[PDB]
Structure formats: structure tokens, C-alpha cells
Amino acid sequence: GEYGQRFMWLWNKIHDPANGYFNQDGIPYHSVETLICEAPDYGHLTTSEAFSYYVWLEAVYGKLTGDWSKFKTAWDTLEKYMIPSAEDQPMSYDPNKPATYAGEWETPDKYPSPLEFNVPVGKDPLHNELVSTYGSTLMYGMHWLMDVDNWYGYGKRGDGVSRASFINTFQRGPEESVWETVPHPSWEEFKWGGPNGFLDLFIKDQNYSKQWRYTDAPDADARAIQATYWAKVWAKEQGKFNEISSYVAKAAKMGDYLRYAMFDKYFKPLGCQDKNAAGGTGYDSAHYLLSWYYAWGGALWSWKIGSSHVHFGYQNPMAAWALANDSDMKPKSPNGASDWAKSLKRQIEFYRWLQSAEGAIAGGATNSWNGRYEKYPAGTATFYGMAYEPNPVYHDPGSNTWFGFQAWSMQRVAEYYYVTGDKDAGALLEKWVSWVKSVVKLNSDGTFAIPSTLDWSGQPDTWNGAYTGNSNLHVKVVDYGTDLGITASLANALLYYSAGTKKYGVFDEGAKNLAKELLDRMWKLYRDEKGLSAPEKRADYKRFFEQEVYIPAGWIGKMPNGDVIKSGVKFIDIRSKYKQDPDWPKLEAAYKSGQAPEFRYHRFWAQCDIAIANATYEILF
Ligand SMILES: [Ca+2]
């Protein structure tokens, strides 16, 4: 079939060693080009989102093929490399005191953040159940960032040499952009950085211990699960399910632990609005959404920490439903499926509460105003006691000034609607597709433009379980662009909606046609040697040179390659190896010329989305 030809074409552009999307271990890079900085700060780093897209690409491949080897392989790599093994996470945890509270602060210069030992932390209610269920104490979820070819030089567990090195960057609050971090190893032996390693850049304590720390990106895990749901439906169609047996089980175990994404940072109760208030005793601290993260720390004592900030872009109803309803994907814990049923509905309510008057989905909510459980301002709209935030978690740039989440997240809703016919999902999607149609530009010459940067106004109405119209919440498109990963994901969302519409109501041909046009114009214009790519102006890359990384006066340390870490140091001064990047002179030239440098990037996830969107047109039509 034709749109599946398209998929095949890109699938082995991706799987051709020549083009170089994977490292020697089969770990996909964030992108083929190395000189890139946006969420990771270098291209041959990779992310938990990349792995989840890899699994998804293969699920779709084995649906179109009957060949589930590639799917099995992609999961094999993911469990092996991106999920901390037993040696990666050795422990004695106390569910009643799961962590010691530290605040979040407005700027990076207010860090390291002091522990506050008087601040009550609440009860972790998932742990004892999860031990009972699995026999293990190991946590089964992906850490979000990896240095796949050991570019930074921290290695495995401190060996400064192994590939697939667990690192972390973002640690110092909502203004710490990708440009303002100090990349550090997840496993801390004090072999680099200062006397206490890098710990004392981020946390203020009397004494510091060697330890490990991991941070899950829940959208990533959920996508992996979403992916595995389709691999289960698709293998079962073909009578090959049992082949994929234990891999659906991986998804369900992952699903079971992913419930840590559902809780306030410090198991504090929803609505508390005071750091000194008592901790939750159970599910009163569950927001039942996929939060910006869960994190687990552990001494070489133990900590577990959810997150108080939620972004709609991180939600996944399809995954939630799959875990909650499909008996093959059922998590083994007593309460697992059940918590996921609650998450499914809370998520859908969340999306509807965030729906602007125009139809775009606004950012999110927090249970911890300023990340310090402060009192909400007068007039603040709320969702189950959480405060609306236009840009939750990060502000530089604003986390919901990126059009991309609209597509990523509504694709998942559109899947859930197709499977299910849920009326709220449908009514949500209706008003959103309407908006999409009104803002996508199809030009006469066959070029197209999707929104890139969004801006926001006002607030939703406070949630009371039923849609109101949110007539004071307003989206504005600030500019347009030609992001192909997003363009394809937008197409993918339009296709699942249109499909569901045919299946459950009045068929929306408009939607399908708008998607097709996007998938067609893209394929005709932006095809190239390594897959697809469009020109991209990166003015912000001046920050390579100009961005000062905050280091405390008196703090002295070294990166593994010898770069000195001290006050005044810039972004590039702690990443000197960038100067031997093939694109360095091009970048240098443009910085001095005074105009934005240009790239034609091949992000794994982008190429994965383009693939899956074309394939999804065939599967549905
Ligand atoms: Ca900043």
C-alpha cells in the first residue's frame, strides 16, 4: 500500500547505518547532527522521548509487516540502556518520610537550595504495594537523558569511559534554560566537579554523600506504553501476540511504576497552599495526572519525589485507558489499573479545563505556587485545588509558548477518542481541530506553515467538572514555521480524529484532507538524503557564546575533559569539545556576521513522527 510505501522509505533511511541515527549499541541519538541544543544540549545525547518514539516506529513497522523482531529489539535496547539496572540503583526507603523538602527559586543564582527539615513531607502510598507486587525494590522507568557516546566523559557509574552514560542537567528552577546548566553525572562519586561533586550546586546541606539520582519524563514512558498497546492490538490481529507477550508485560510494569508521576512533589495534599501544612496520608496528594516528573535519589538512605507541576503536553489518555481497561496491559499491582482509570478521567477534565475560548489547550497547573507551596494570588483559577499556570515548570522559553505540545498531546487524545468514542474527548477534539484548521497555512505554491510560537492571555474558569467555554482564556499565534516532526504529529492527530468521527458521528473529511495535504506537501518539498528536513533559523544560538552559567563565588571544579568550572564561565567554556564540531566555524561565522545560523536537522523523533503519520494514513484509510 502507498502511504505505507512512504513509511518503508523513511523507515530504512532511519535504519541505514550510512545515515547514522543510532550508535554502535543501537541506541538512537537525539539527532544525526551533533551541533544542536534545545532540550538536550548536544545531538548525540539522547532522551527517554527518543527511545519511546523508537518503540513506536517499530510497533508500526511490525503492523505493516508481520515482523515483530524490530519491535522486540527496540524494547531490548531500551530496557538494557535507558532503564537503570540493579547496579545503577542500589538502596532502605521510608514511605512516611520519602524525602526532605527543598524549595524552588525564581533564578539559578538563588541555588543551591537549602533543605528545610521542619517542612512536613507526606506519605508515599505506592511503595509497599509495588514491593509486594514485584519482589524487587528496583524502579522500572526510563531516566530522561543519556550521554550515549560518552561525550561529556562521566562514563558508567563513574568510570569516565563507558558509553550509555546517565547524566542530568536541569536542576535550578524555572529560569534555568538549556543554556544555563552544569551537566553532571546521575551517579555521583565526587570524581568531578568540586569536593562534593556537583551536589552542592543544587542542594544546601551540612554534609554530602556519594549517591545516585534519576529523573523520569512521564510523557516518554507513557508513549512507550501507548506504543506497546498498538503493538499488542496489532500482533493479536495477526495471531502473533504470544511472540510479544513479555513485552506487553514490560509496558504494564512500567505503567505500574509510572503512577509516581501522579503525586505532588512532597506528597503534600492538593490545595494545601502552605509549606508548613501536614503531609498527605495517601491519595490526597495524588493529582492523578502525568506530572513533569518523578525522581528517585539513593545513597551509594533513599528518596522518592513526584512533581507538583503539570503540563497538558505531558498527558496521555490512550496510555491511561490502555492500562486501565485492556486486560492484556493490566498492571499486576492490586490498585494499578484502578489508579489509571482515575488518571484517565482527570486528564480529560484537565484538557477540557485548559481549552482556550479559541480551542488551543493552555499550559497547566501547580500544587506548589513558586515551587514553595505559597498562597495563590487573589482570583487565580483552579483545578482540584491546583493553580492555573500558563507556562508550567519552565519559563525560558515559556513551556507552552511551543506549538509542538498541541500536536503531541492532542494526538494521544485523538487516539483515545478513536478507540473509545468518549464524548468529552470528542467535544474537546472538535473545538481543537476547528482551531487547527483556522491557523494552519496551506500556501498556493504548495508550501505550508504551522504555528511555532504561541502566547497566552487570561485564565480558565475554575473547574467544577463541566465545560464552560473558558471565554477569558485566549491563545495568540506569534509566528509560523515548518517543523516537520510537529507538522506530521498534527497530521497524525487529525487522522485519528477524522477516523473516530467517521466511526462515531459526522465524518470530518476536512480534517483528513488537511492532514493529507500536510503529509503530501511535506513529502514533495523537504525530502533529502538522510530522511526529511527543512531549513531552520536558530538566532538563539548566540547563547553558546554569550550565556553566563551561574556558579557560586568560591566554587571551583573541573569537567572530565579538564574544562574549569567557576564564576563567570560561559556555556561553551564548560563544553570546549564543541570547538571540534564540524559545524563550529559555520556557527562562529554567523554569530559574528550578526545573523541567525541555519540548519537542516534530522531529529530522530521528528523522522519517527513523519514515518508514523504517513503510516497512520494507510492504517486508517
Ligand atoms: Ca534563564
Side-chain angles (χ1 to χ4, degrees), residues 55-102:
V55 167
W56 196 17
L57 178 62
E58 299 325 293
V60 165
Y61 174 84
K63 152 67 173 186
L64 259 46
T65 286
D67 184 7
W68 294 107
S69 53
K70 314 317 215 323
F71 177 85
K72 287 194 282 194
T73 302
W75 256 105
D76 278 325
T77 312
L78 186 153
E79 161 153 5
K80 191 183 177 193
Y81 293 124
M82 207 71 177
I83 305 198
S85 80
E87 296 91 329
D88 288 312
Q89 43 162 315
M91 308 129 301
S92 65
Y93 178 71
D94 180 10
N96 301 305
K97 182 66 173 174
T100 305
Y101 161 101

Side-chain angles (χ1 to χ4, degrees), residues 208-267:
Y208 294 95
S209 304
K210 298 174 188 202
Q211 60 188 86
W212 53 266
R213 301 147 297 162
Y214 306 105
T215 306
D216 187 298
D219 55 335
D221 289 16
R223 191 185 296 98
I225 298 181
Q226 173 192 350
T228 305
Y229 164 76
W230 291 111
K232 115 81 203 296
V233 166
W234 295 332
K236 193 144 158 191
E237 279 192 311
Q238 303 166 348
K240 295 172 184 172
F241 164 90
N242 337 56
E243 214 180 313
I244 267 55
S245 158
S246 52
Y247 294 85
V248 163
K250 285 164 172 18
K253 162 150 51 52
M254 163 150 83
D256 213 347
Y257 279 88
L258 179 49
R259 298 184 296 158
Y260 272 104
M262 283 171 205
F263 289 84
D264 183 74
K265 203 179 180 191
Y266 291 114
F267 302 90

Side-chain angles (χ1 to χ4, degrees), residues 372-563:
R372 302 187 296 268
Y373 306 99
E374 295 189 354
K375 191 138 165 282
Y376 307 155
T380 301
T382 67
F383 177 85
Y384 286 87
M386 300 180 61
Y388 167 68
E389 279 191 302
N391 294 287
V393 191
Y394 294 124
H395 300 162
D396 186 18
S399 68
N400 208 39
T401 65
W402 189 49
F403 175 78
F405 284 120
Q406 300 300 314
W408 275 8
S409 206
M410 297 303 303
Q411 192 283 331
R412 307 185 263 247
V413 169
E415 281 195 8
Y416 168 70
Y417 174 57
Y418 166 85
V419 183
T420 259
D422 188 81
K423 255 66 165 208
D424 289 288
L428 176 58
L429 291 157
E430 187 170 19
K431 201 211 197 91
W432 183 80
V433 171
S434 187
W435 178 65
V436 167
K437 288 173 170 172
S438 85
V439 296
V440 176
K441 280 171 167 177
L442 292 179
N443 304 285
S444 201
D445 66 30
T447 77
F448 62 90
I450 67 179
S452 181
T453 292
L454 299 183
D455 188 33
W456 297 91
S457 277
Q459 292 199 111
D461 300 319
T462 284
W463 195 238
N464 211 41
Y467 195 47
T468 79
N470 289 337
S471 67
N472 303 327
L473 187 52
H474 293 296
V475 66
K476 270 145 285 134
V477 168
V478 172
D479 70 5
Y480 287 80
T482 197
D483 194 310
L484 278 35
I486 284 81
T487 290
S489 168
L490 186 62
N492 181 334
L494 291 162
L495 268 18
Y496 269 103
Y497 172 62
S498 204
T501 293
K502 192 177 192 166
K503 191 168 155 196
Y504 296 115
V506 45
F507 185 30
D508 189 338
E509 266 213 319
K512 147 156 155 26
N513 297 338
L514 171 52
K516 183 99 150 32
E517 275 294 276
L518 289 183
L519 257 15
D520 284 348
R521 295 179 187 220
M522 187 177 99
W523 199 263
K524 172 180 174 303
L525 278 170
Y526 297 115
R527 224 138 47 109
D528 81 4
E529 193 55 44
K530 290 202 266 290
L532 291 89
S533 70
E536 184 182 328
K537 241 74 174 171
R538 299 305 300 268
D540 57 310
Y541 280 17
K542 61 172 183 183
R543 292 180 83 160
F544 268 88
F545 309 98
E546 300 186 359
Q547 184 63 64
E548 183 186 310
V549 180
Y550 178 74
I551 302 291
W555 202 101
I556 282 156
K558 270 156 71 71
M559 300 291 288
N561 82 332
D563 292 331

